[PDB]
RNA sequence: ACUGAAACUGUAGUAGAACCAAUCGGGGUCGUCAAUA
């Protein structure tokens, strides 16, 4: 098939990491309001990403305390700006179909994450 | 169809009385980290 989509890139993050992924934008969608609490919480979820590892970048650490030869995952080295959760910034949604609609549950920068 | 003269706006009086630059705070301490395939 063919598809448009977005890119979606975090670095070679951890070690078995062979492939990028590309949200498929052409084919299904489904709109959900963002409310406030889902935006802060992913303020909460990313500044916790970017101050654990602070002094990790400052002393110059190309990557993760336990893996070696991974490297930062985006949001970690991002700025600020990855907390902000502007408009047409990608994430994962924690969904499920309970009472009959698509609840978000929460918003996350990688598939199995903090 | 003759300019008056001469005479210190000086003398006495404290920009001061009162008010705390101060109140709270052990130079301390432990769990991971990372997200794919």
């Known amino acids: 098939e063919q598809f448009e989509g977005f890119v979606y890139k975090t670095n070679k993050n951890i070690g078995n990491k062979h492939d990028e992924r590309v949200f498929i934008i052409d084919r299904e969608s489904i ?9 802060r919480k992913w303020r909460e979820l990313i500044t ?3 101050e654990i590892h602070k002094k990790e970048v400052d002393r110059g650490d190309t990557g993760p305390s336990a893996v070696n030869g991974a490297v930062w995952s985006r949001q970690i080295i991002a700025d600020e700006s990855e907390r902000n959760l502007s408009d047409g910034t990608l994430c994962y949604a924690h969904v499920k179909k309970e009472d009959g609609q698509y609840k978000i549950l929460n918003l996350y920068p990688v598939m199995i994450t903090r």
């Open 48 to 50: 916790s990403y970017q």
């Open 31 to 39: 709109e959900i309001p963002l409310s406030r609490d889902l935006r």
